[PDB]
Design a protein around this ligand. Sequence first.
Ligand SMILES: Nc1nc2c(c(=O)[nH]1)N[C@H]1C(S)=C(S)[C@@H](COP(=O)(O)OP(=O)(O)OC[C@H]3O[C@@H](n4cnc5c(=O)[nH]c(N)nc54)[C@H](O)[C@@H]3O)O[C@H]1N2
Ligand SMILES: Nc1nc2c(c(=O)[nH]1)N[C@H]1C(S)=C(S)[C@@H](COP(=O)(O)OP(=O)(O)OC[C@H]3O[C@@H](n4cnc5c(=O)[nH]c(N)nc54)[C@H](O)[C@@H]3O)O[C@H]1N2
Ligand code: F3S
Ligand code: FES
Ligand SMILES: [Mo+4]
Ligand SMILES: [O]
Lengths: 128, 820
Amino acid sequence: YPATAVSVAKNLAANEPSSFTYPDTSSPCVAVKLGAPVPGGVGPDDDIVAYSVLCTHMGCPTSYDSSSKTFSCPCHFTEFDAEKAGQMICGEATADLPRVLLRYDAASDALTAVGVDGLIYGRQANVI
Amino acid sequence: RITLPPANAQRTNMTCHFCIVGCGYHVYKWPELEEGGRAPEQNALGLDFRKQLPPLASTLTPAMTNVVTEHDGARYDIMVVPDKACVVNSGLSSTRGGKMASYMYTPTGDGKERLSAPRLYAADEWVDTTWDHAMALYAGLIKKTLDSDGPQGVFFSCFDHGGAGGGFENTWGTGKLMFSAIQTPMVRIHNRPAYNSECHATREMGIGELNNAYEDAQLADVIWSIGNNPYESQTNYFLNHWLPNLQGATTSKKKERFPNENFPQARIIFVDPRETPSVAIARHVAGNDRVLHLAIEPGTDTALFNGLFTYVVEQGWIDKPFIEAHTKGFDDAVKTNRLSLDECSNITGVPVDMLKRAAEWSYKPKASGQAPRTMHAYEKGIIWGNDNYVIQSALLDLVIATHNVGRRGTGCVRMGGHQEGYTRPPYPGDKKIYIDQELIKGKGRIMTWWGCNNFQTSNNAQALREAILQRSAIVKQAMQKARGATTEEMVDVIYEATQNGGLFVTSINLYPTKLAEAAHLMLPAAHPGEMNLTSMNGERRIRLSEKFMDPPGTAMADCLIAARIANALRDMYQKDGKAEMAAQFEGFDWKTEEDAFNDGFRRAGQPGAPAIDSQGGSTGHLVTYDRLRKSGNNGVQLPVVSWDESKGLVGTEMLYTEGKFDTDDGKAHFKPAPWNGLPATVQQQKDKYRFWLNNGRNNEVWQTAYHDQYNSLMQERYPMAYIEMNPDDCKQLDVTGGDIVEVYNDFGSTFAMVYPVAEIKRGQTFMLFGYVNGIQGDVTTDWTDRDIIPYYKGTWGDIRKVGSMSEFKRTVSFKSRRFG
Ligand SMILES: Nc1nc2c(c(=O)[nH]1)N[C@H]1C(S)=C(S)[C@@H](COP(=O)(O)OP(=O)(O)OC[C@H]3O[C@@H](n4cnc5c(=O)[nH]c(N)nc54)[C@H](O)[C@@H]3O)O[C@H]1N2
Ligand SMILES: Nc1nc2c(c(=O)[nH]1)N[C@H]1C(S)=C(S)[C@@H](COP(=O)(O)OP(=O)(O)OC[C@H]3O[C@@H](n4cnc5c(=O)[nH]c(N)nc54)[C@H](O)[C@@H]3O)O[C@H]1N2
Ligand code: F3S
Ligand code: FES
Ligand SMILES: [Mo+4]
Ligand SMILES: [O]
C-alpha cells in the first residue's frame, strides 16, 4: 500500500468529512474528525477515522449523516456506523465498510493513509 | 483479495437456502490455486477486473467465497453469487443469502462444527459413533416401542417447509417414514405444536395462500402489508418488486396490460402495532403522503378488517356482480361482522380519518371506472396473532367482497417464511394433538427433532425445555449405569428408563444446537449444494438447487436418512422373523435424493400411486431434474400446465382468474369473524404485567442463528438477543444501550440487551425471537387457536434491570435501524 498524505489534523473541521482517494484515484474515501474519541480513532483527540465511501454490497457511493455519524447507502438502504469501525447497523452487505488506516504524526500533524482494513468494492484486491 | 474463477470454471444453479423469496444464485467451483484472468473473457464472471468496476456491476465480497475440501482430499475454490438473469431477484443478494459461501461446510470456516458423523452422549459428553451403531440403537428403540406401545410411543417434531432443511424430496422422505411406515400421529411441525396449517380459514374459504405472482406486486395500485416486516423478512421481493412499483418504474407494464384505466401513484398500507424498518423505508421512497401505517392495538386485526369490510359495503365499494356469481355467504357476513368506523377506531386505536383514507385508496372506484388493484400481503403478525382462524376469516371477507384475488395486480397472500416444498402422505390421525404438552405430561418413549430446534422456538418454551431436560436426564443416568453393555442390552436399559419417566432424544441436524443439551443421539444432515434439492418460492416458482460438493463426513440428505432408518427397521424385523412388520418398511430403496423426488412429488395423483398431498399437484410428473436444470433459476410457476421440447415447462402465473375457487361449489366462501378481544390466558398476563412483549425478525439474523452463532461479525453485532424499548421507558428503568434486562411473567423468564428505539411506543417492546443467547419464547403463553395455532405475538410481562455488560457497549452499535 502507498503512503498517501490525506491532510493535517488541524484542517479537519469537526464532523466535516474530507474527500480523498486511496489507494488510487479510482477509490474514493473520506476522513472525518468525529468530535469524541472512539477506538481506532487517531489524532490529538483519537477521533479521526476514515473509510472508503463505496458500499461493499453493490458499489453505490454512501453519504455521511453528520447527526448520526453513520454512512448511508441509498441503493438498498444499508447503514454503517462510523463510530464502530464501519459495523453494519442494518442492511444487505456482508462486511463492515472498508476502513482506511491513518497514521498521525504529532510532529508534523499530518495524517497519512497507509492501509485498508477490509476489501474496497469492485476490485480483486485493494491495490490494483 | 479475491480469487477469480477461470472462464471454464464449473457453474451450477443454487436457490438461496433461506427465505421464501428464493433468490437465484450461481455457484462457481474450480481447483484451489488456479486463478482466472482479469480480462473479461478470462474469468467465468465475464467482468473486467483490469480496472475498477462501476457501481451495481456485481455483488462480490470475500464472504461470498470459500475453499472447500472434497472427500477425495482435493481443495476447491467456490464462489456463490446472485444471478442477474433470475427474475425473482434480478441479481440482488440479501445479507443472509450473501453469506451462503461462508456457511458452506469447510473444516476451518464458520461451518467447522457441522455434524460429520452420528454423535452419541456417553461419559457425560459427545463422541462420534457410526451409522450402523446409531441405527442399531435408533431402530432398536423404535422397534421395541412399536412392538410394545404401538406408533403412539414415537414422537417427532419435523420441518414441513422448503429450502435448506426442507424440500419436496425431504418432506416426502420424512412423511413417508413418519406417516406411512411408522404410522405415528404424534407429530408436530417445526413452527407449530400440532399437525395443522397456518392457513386453515383462507383455504376452507377457497383461497390457497400463494395465489399470485411477484409481478402482481409490480402491477398493484395499492399494497397492504399486514403483520409483516417485508424489507427484513422477504427483502428482495420488497426490493425487486414492491419498491420499483412505488418508484414509478412499473407504470409502462400497467399501461401495456390494462387499457382505459388510470394508474395513480402506487401506495402502501401497513397493519402493524410497531413502526418498523419497512415502514421507514417505504416512507423514504414514496413519501409520507403515500404510506399509511395503521399502528393498531396488539391483537385487534379482526376488529380492523370487520370495520373496513362494513365500511366498503356501506359505501358500495364492492364488486357486486362478482359477489353474486362467485361467492356464498355475503349477506350473513355483513350481519355478523358489522362494526362502525367509530367502534373500529375505539377498539384499534386507529384514527377514523386514517381508516377512511385506507379504504378510499384501496377500494373506491378509480376515475376510469375500475376498482383499484389491491394486493393484500400478510404474514406472522396475524398468523401467530389473536386467533389465527378468525383474523383470516375477517381479512378474506374484505378481499373477496372487493374482488382482490384473481385480478392481476391483486391477491391476498402469505408473504411466507421459509420456501415451500411439501409432498407427503396424509397425516395418520383424526385429532389435532398439542405435542409439547403430551411430552411435558410424560407421554412418549422416543422423541426426534428433525430439522428444527423447539428449545428456542416453541411457545411457552421454558416449560418444554425443563421437562425434556428432566426426562432426558433419567435416560442418561441409566445409560451411564450400563456402560459396557451391548447395543441390544442398552436398548432395553433405555426403554426401561422411559417406562420410569425417561425420554430418549434424537436430533437430526446440521449442528449440535441447544438440543445437544438434552439429546442422546444426533444424526448429520446435508444442505443444498451438498445434495440436489427442489422447492418453490412465494409465487410457486419451483427450482432445482444442484449438488456441487460433498457433505461433511458421512452426513447425508434427510430423505436418505429417512430411508436409512426405514431399511434398518425392515432388516431388524426380518432378523426377528416378523415378515409383516418388515414389509411395512419397504419402499425406501433410494440411492440419491432424486429417487425421493421420483417416488413422491412425481407420483402424485398418478395411477397406482398411494394417497399423496403435493404442492406440485397431479401434473408434478411433468417436472424432472433435467427439465428444471434447463429452466435455470427462473424455473417454472406451479402448477405446471404442460411441457414440450420447444417451450419447456409452462406454468401458471396467478390462481383464481376465472372466479373458480378451491371449494365444493367453486365459489369463495365468506365466514363470520367474531371480535372477542384478547384470549383470557393472554388478557390475564396483560392485566398483571406492564409491557407488551412483541417479538420477531431482525434483517441480519436467520432464524435460530444456527450458522450465525459461528460468524464473528454476527457474534460482535448481536452477542445477545436484543429488545427494542421506548427511550422514556428506558430512562424510567435506568437502562441504556447494552444493559441487560430480565423479562418475565407467569410463563417464564428471559433476558436481552437493551436497544433504545424512539419509534417503540411506551409500554411496548420488540425482542429478537428464537435466539441462542436469550430465548424470547420463554415468556410466550400456551394459548393457541381452535386448530392449535399459537398466539406467539400475544404476551405481556414485566422488565427489570439486571446489570451492565461493558463488552456489549464496546462492540455493539445501538444506532437506529430505521433508515431515515
Ligand atoms: N416467540 C416466537 N416464537 C416463534 C416465532 C415467533 O414469531 N415468535 N416464529 C415461529 C416460526 S414462524 C418459525 S419458522 C419457527 C422456527 O423454528 P425452528 O424450525 O425450530 O427454527 P429453525 O432455526 O428454522 O430450525 C432449523 C434447524 O434445522 C437445522 N438444519 C438446517 N438445515 C438443515 C438440513 O438440511 N437438515 C437438517 N436435518 N437440519 C437442518 C438448523 O441447524 C436448525 O437447528 O419458530 C416459531 N417460534
Ligand atoms: N432476516 C430474516 N428473514 C426471515 C426470517 C429470519 O429469521 N430472518 N425467517 C423467515 C420466516 S420462517 C418467517 S415465519 C418470516 C416472518 O415474517 P414477518 O411475519 O414479516 O416477520 P415477524 O417479525 O415475525 O413479524 C411481522 C410483524 O408482525 C407485527 N405484529 C406483532 N403483533 C401483531 C399483531 O397482533 N397484529 C399485527 N397486524 N401485526 C403484529 C410485528 O410488529 C412485526 O413487525 O420471515 C422469514 N424471513
Ligand atoms: S432468498 Fe435469500 S434470505 Fe433472497 S431475500 Fe431471502 S437472498
Ligand atoms: S449497493 Fe449499498 S445497500 Fe446495496
Ligand atoms: Mo416461519
Ligand atoms: O414460518
